[PDB]
Amino acid sequence: DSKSIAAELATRGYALVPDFLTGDALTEAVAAIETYFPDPEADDSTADDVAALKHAVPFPFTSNALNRHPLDLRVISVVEELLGTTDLRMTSSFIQAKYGTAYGESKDQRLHNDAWAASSLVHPRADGVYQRVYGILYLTDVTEDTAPTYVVDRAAHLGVPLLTPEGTGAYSKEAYPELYERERPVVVSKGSLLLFVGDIVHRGSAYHGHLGRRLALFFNIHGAQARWTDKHLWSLRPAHPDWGTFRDLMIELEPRQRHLLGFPPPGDDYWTEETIKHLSEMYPGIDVEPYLPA
């Protein structure tokens, strides 16, 4: 219910959606993220192998059991309801592993907001089409011992500025002790999705357990009206080994989903006989009907 979830986001800054993935969709997403981040308790990897891998990896991924979820139409509908626009873009997406203390020290982030674009070009607004929506799709069970996300509330609800005197969107413990007294962990079963507005005060946390790792898919979405904000940048060409997965994603996605990647919408001046032709060449089997010029 986009109206219900948007109301939770508006009033408390976050909403936890249980069982966002279930059944085969969940098992497939778990298997896909496990191809990147192993588990020495369950496979033949070691702490040395784990330390040699990067623990955060950007979209697009090697499986559409990960690539499709930031573009899920249930998520898009929530964001459209909250922002009041359909002209949305995926700002970023990455997968992440946080390993237990047997694999090295794990440290907490400071409480912060994510209301800002990366360039800080202009100050954020927390209303209307200027809001940002973040998702964390948990692919392992998350307890207080396994690096839960911590949340407080929307910055304005706490009276704290989006730009602090230190010149960032982060809140030090010495300047903002009351925020740390109010923070709470989000505990969640695998397949749950945490949604939050970017102006919420929140943080990642250290993994306190010795063994295991938390696995999650991250993404965030903005309205194109916030035109100083970048959509997710990646580099790929048809020659690349990862192209086939991305090509297959583009064929699978519906027009409403492709829109978040900056795809030219139906009726856009981009579409001509030649660009329809090259679209079918690059994505064989894609449905060109919504884009055909009159």
Nearer to Fe ion, 83 or 201 (CB): 201
205, with CB counted inside 10 A (0-12, 13-18, 19+), is buried
Query: What number of chain residues touch Fe ion (CB under 5 A)?
Result: 1
Nearer to Fe ion, 67 or 92 (CB): 92
- 204 secondary structure, DSSP code: -
Q: Which part of the chain contacts Fe ion (CB under 5 A), choosing from 49-57, 95-103, 112-120, 179-187?
A: 112-120
In a 10 Å sphere around its CB, with 0-12 CB exposed, 13-18 middle and 19+ buried, how is residue 284 labelled? exposed
Q: Cα separation of 89 and 230, whole Å?
A: 9
Distance in Å, CB of 171 to Fe ion, minimum: 12
**Would you state the structure tokens that stand for residue 137, as one six-digit string?**
């799709």
- C-beta closer to Fe ion: residue 203 or 258: 203
Span interacting with Fe ion, options 24-32, 68-76, 114-122, 217-225, rule CB under 5 A? 114-122
| Cα–Cα distance, 148 to 205 (Å, whole number) | 6
Q: Report in angstroms how near the CB of residue 134 gets to Fe ion at its nearest.
A: 7
Least distance (Å) between residue 183 CB and Fe ion: 13
Q: Does 114 bind Fe ion (CB under 5 A)?
A: yes
Sheet with 56-58, side-by-side order of all strands: 14-17, 193-197, 133-138, 213-223, 88-99, 56-58
3-class state of residue 31 by DSSP: helix
Rounded distance, CA 25 to CA 37, Å?
Answer: 19
CB of 202 to Fe ion, least distance (A): 6
Could you say which residues in the range 154-193 bind Fe ion, by CB under 5 A? none
- The least distance separating Fe ion from the CB of residue 20, rounded to whole angstroms, comes to 20
Both tokens assigned to 134? 């973040």
At 67, list the tokens. 């690539």
Q: How far apart are CA 288 and CA 59, in angstroms?
A: 25
Q: Identify residue 171 by its one-letter amino acid code.
A: Y
Nearer to Fe ion, 114 or 153 (CB): 114
Q: In the complex with Fe ion, which residue's Cβ is closer, 36 or 116? A: 116
Cis, bond preceding 293 (omega within 30 deg of 0): no
Choose the stretch contacting Fe ion; rule: CB under 5 A; options: 17-25, 29-37, 106-114, 222-230: 106-114
Kindly tell me the burial class for residue 39, based on how many C-beta atoms sit within 10 Å of its own C-beta (0-12, 13-18, 19 or more).
Answer: middle
Question: Which of 69/132 has CB closer to Fe ion?
Answer: 132
| Contact status, residue 185 vs residue 108, Cβ threshold 8 Å | no
Least Cβ distance, residue 196 to Fe ion (angstroms): 9
Task: Output the smallest distance, CB 251 to Fe ion, in A.
Answer: 33
Smallest gap, in angstroms, from Cβ of residue 268 to Fe ion?
Answer: 33
User: How far apart are the two ends of the chain, measured CA to CA in Å?
Assistant: 36
72-80, 110-118, 146-154, 214-222 -> range binding Fe ion (CB under 5 A): 110-118
Contact status: 199 vs Fe ion (CB under 5 A): no
Q: Which residue is nearest to Fe ion (CB)?
A: 114
Closer residue to Fe ion in complex, CB, 185/264: 185
Closer Cβ to Fe ion, 138 or 246, answer by number? 138
Which residues lie near Fe ion (CB under 5 A)?
A: 114
